[PDB]
Ligand binder design. Structure first.
Ligand code: HEM
Ligand code: HEM
Ligand SMILES: N=C(Nc1cccc(CCNCc2cccc(NC(=N)c3ccco3)c2)c1)c1ccco1
Ligand SMILES: N=C(Nc1cccc(CCNCc2cccc(NC(=N)c3ccco3)c2)c1)c1ccco1
Ligand SMILES: C[C@H](O)[C@H](O)[C@H]1CNc2nc(N)[nH]c(=O)c2N1
Ligand SMILES: C[C@H](O)[C@H](O)[C@H]1CNc2nc(N)[nH]c(=O)c2N1
Ligand SMILES: [Ca+2]
Ligand SMILES: [Cl-]
Ligand SMILES: [Cl-]
Ligand SMILES: [Gd]
Ligand SMILES: [Gd]
Ligand SMILES: [Gd]
Ligand SMILES: [Zn+2]
Lengths: 403, 402
């Protein structure tokens, strides 16, 4: 009843007994596996999720079955009966945010899941106040390059009132300007959000690394435009330790990855606006963001500059250029003293996380296709580690775009 | 019908072939086990045999014709007369091609229509097994112009043991347990190296000692056979610009010939049916030479390249891995031995996916095995969603004979 899980480098075997607690269904069936898909898509149903969450909280502090445990279950149950919903205690909100991170199958950085600064913005009332909370988040998390993981959670969804939403997918994003000749200047992943910014009154730039404004949605209001103070947005110019012409490409990336479009679910309550941030793994910038053909797509230009033979695939010019672009990212962030982790250290720490979690909970939900880095996969230990993917709660969840 | 998206181009297909999945994979709505390596009656036979004959005749457009009805009745009588039945040679050919075409973990299936089938179903002993295998290796090697081939030995049946090739491949380098715990040679082959020794093989002591074959005819024990060295084409590994790379003494063999999988066709089972194609360069230069539990040479190369190995963030592992793959591609091309690099191979699999969408509404594919083990996202398959399911005919794993 419990999946056997093998590490093929070491030969070691565990059994994932935690998957038996998966609280929601994924996309696979015995007939076919859809694990490679990007989008795998009241009263006492809310109550059973809430009771489970409270059970998790009281287990974490080693007070299960205590008087305080029972009283809090009764308190939640009575509030759901009266009002159709309930409120988390402050301590429960902190625990639930950390649990949602811990439960995220596609996150390789979960060794850190216990170190998370939780800003409680549940009393936020307007889009202006939203912006203040977000600026305080960026300042705290950036910390002049010594990055600190943080999450700010805005008011929960409730009936009779629209959601708080941040329309941008991240707090810091470069504009992508759609070109009439099909192409794009800037980041192509951000074409749609760029057009929404202009529609709502932003005067666009014409550079490749123009920081986007924020579109902030308060309940039952159209989004409002807010410009980030340039000194809040720490950026790193990209150079290479030995390829001095690299600096002339004029490349740059931003310090702080702050994801703002996912939904945080805790004990059946839903928080549609709860941006979270940590720090980058360098392959995100060096491999995906700069070398994906549908992103900045610089691979061929760098290889030409390296005087590689780009006319035959078998010279492995693509692999050589990509490796140096990753070197440039790592070197440039270290030179600027901005926290970054390379894919070797990050995957080694995840292996330690897996072993911690096997002891602590008897398994760990993990999405192999997302945990293995996009370069050098089998050079990292996670490649050889079998993994079990499943959905626990608290959880970070995809949600529709509010437009 | 699952929706399948390519995230580089934005194109959308629907896999209608998955609905015909013959067996069950390991996944459930509760949890996905797609990353696991091993996904943990006369009526039974007849049902599978009928589906396959129907597959075959539909594929030659003799659909429901008189040749179709007659073959169905022959199978029925043969199983009642004997408990099994015999494939026609054209059905055997079609069945081996389909089993390759259906293999979810094979990135080289663009070639699925081009397969030489050697019918060894009349084989009698391990000596004859050795002859078939030597002919296969000769034909497939073809002086380095590799040609895909499979040899099919007699099916299993009740009352009689099976034919088996005990070696996982026809060409394997010995793995020698050492008195200091380590392994000299290939750690993957420590078990079969000891089995060969146990059955009376004089061991070598090199890192690339080609193993003998342990071949097993029904019910008598296995016999050791030595491969004639001139039959085993090898490629000494050199680097186009790192002159010292040659002196590391690395080599690999030309012909990847997998000999421990079971071929299933129409409910019949062939426990010995060795098949061969040619290598994708990452199999050798990344997995076989750089896996920590294989030859594990990555740090050796990095030291020779004078890389800074005391910090992960110099990406010394990545640079050395790439140059080892460069040396592999260079050495095979120089030796005029067929090889395909991971860029060309994944570009061809994308075309295969497009051809299969038209041919039969989809294609079973195992994303984790299709995406190469270096430079994953530099290849088109990384951005391609895939659906994994089990069709028949098929190649399946099977327990070791011991
Ligand atoms: C502390 C350093 C961290 C590192 C190095 C890290 C690393 C990563 C990486 C490389 C990914 C895959 C992203 C992609 O390919 O698009 C990811 C995904 C994810 N991370 Fe982490 N992470 C960190 C912290 C955090 C924190 C603080 C949270 C939340 C509190 C978090 C939650 C998530 C979630 C929910 C995903 C899945 C996102 C998706 O499916 O799009 N991570 N992480
Ligand atoms: C002709 C050139 C071919 C290329 C370039 C190629 C490439 C590959 C690669 C790279 C793998 C992954 C193997 C691993 O990582 O261990 C694989 C798997 C596989 N191939 Fe192909 N292959 C070729 C021909 C063939 C042929 C002729 C057959 C059978 C008739 C075949 C059947 C299979 C099967 C069944 C697997 C799955 C193996 C497993 O699960 O262990 N392939 N192929
Ligand atoms: N591709 C699309 N959307 C899309 C869908 C699913 C997934 C993605 C991938 C986008 N992950 C962004 C992301 C999520 C989590 C972590 C990090 N990174 C970190 N280090 C970090 C951040 C915070 C703490 O740590 C980056 C994108 C799309 C839709 C329409 C057109 O394109
Ligand atoms: N060794 C083990 N693990 C393991 C288990 C299952 C599978 C594997 C992976 C081993 N595929 C070998 C293989 C299979 C198919 C294709 C190729 N390559 C080609 N190009 C080729 C050959 C013919 C035509 O083309 C290589 C490894 C094991 C089992 C028990 C203890 O350890
Ligand atoms: C189709 C495939 O699932 C898709 O390209 C995935 C694969 N693995 C990934 N892994 C990470 N970390 N990030 C991604 O965007 C993806 N993309
Ligand atoms: C655990 C994981 O399934 C295992 O390491 C897989 C991953 N992908 C692979 N992909 C290929 N082509 N060959 C392999 O042996 C593997 N091994
Ligand atoms: Ca209250
Ligand atoms: Cl990003
Ligand atoms: Cl191999
Ligand atoms: Gd230089
Ligand atoms: Gd030297
Ligand atoms: Gd060392
Ligand atoms: Zn699955």
């Amino acid at each position: 009843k419990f999946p056997r899980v093998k590490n093929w480098e070491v030969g070691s075997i565990t059994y994932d007994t935690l998957s038996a607690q998966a609280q929601q269904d994924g996309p696979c069936t015995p007939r076919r596996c859809l694990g490679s898909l990007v989008f795998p898509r009241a009263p006492e149903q809310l109550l059973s999720q809430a009771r489970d969450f409270i059970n998790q909280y009281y287990s974490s502090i080693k007070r299960s079955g205590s008087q305080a445990h029972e009283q809090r279950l009764q308190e939640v149950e009575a509030e759901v009966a009266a009002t159709g919903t309930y409120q988390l205690r402050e301590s429960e909100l902190v625990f639930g945010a950390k649990q949602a991170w811990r439960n995220a199958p596609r996150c390789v950085g979960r060794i850190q899941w216990g170190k998370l600064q939780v800003f409680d913005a549940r009393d936020c009332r307007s889009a202006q106040e939203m912006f203040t909370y977000i600026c305080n988040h960026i300042k705290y998390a950036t910390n002049r390059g010594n990055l600190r993981s943080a999450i700010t959670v805005f008011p929960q969804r409730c009936p009779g009132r629209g959601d708080f939403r941040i329309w941008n997918s991240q707090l810091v994003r470069y504009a992508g300007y759609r070109q009439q000749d099909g192409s794009v200047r800037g980041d192509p992943a951000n074409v749609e959000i760029t057009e929404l910014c202009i529609q709502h009154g932003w005067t666009p730039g014409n550079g490749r690394f123009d920081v986007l404004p924020l579109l902030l949605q308060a309940p039952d209001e159209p989004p409002e435009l807010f410009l980030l103070p340039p000194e809040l947005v720490l950026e790193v110019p990209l150079e290479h330790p030995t390829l001095e012409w690299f600096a002339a490409l004029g490349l740059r990336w931003y310090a702080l990855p702050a994801v703002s479009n996912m939904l945080l679910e805790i004990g059946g309550l839903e928080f549609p606006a709860a941006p979270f941030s940590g720090w980058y793994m360098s392959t995100e910038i060096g491999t995906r963001n700069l070398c994906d053909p549908h992103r900045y797509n610089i691979l061929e230009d760098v290889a030409v500059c390296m005087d590689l033979d780009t006319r035959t695939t078998s010279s492995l010019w693509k692999d050589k250029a990509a490796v140096e672009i990753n070197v440039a990212v790592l070197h440039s962030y270290q030179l600027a003293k901005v926290t970054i982790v390379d894919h070797h250290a990050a995957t080694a720490s995840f292996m330690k996380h897996l072993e911690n979690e096997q002891k602590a909970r008897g398994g760990c939900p993990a999405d192999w296709a997302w945990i293995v880095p996009p370069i050098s996969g089998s050079l990292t230990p996670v490649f050889h580690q079998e993994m079990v993917n499943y959905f626990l709660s608290p959880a970070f969840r995809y949600q529709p775009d509010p437009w």
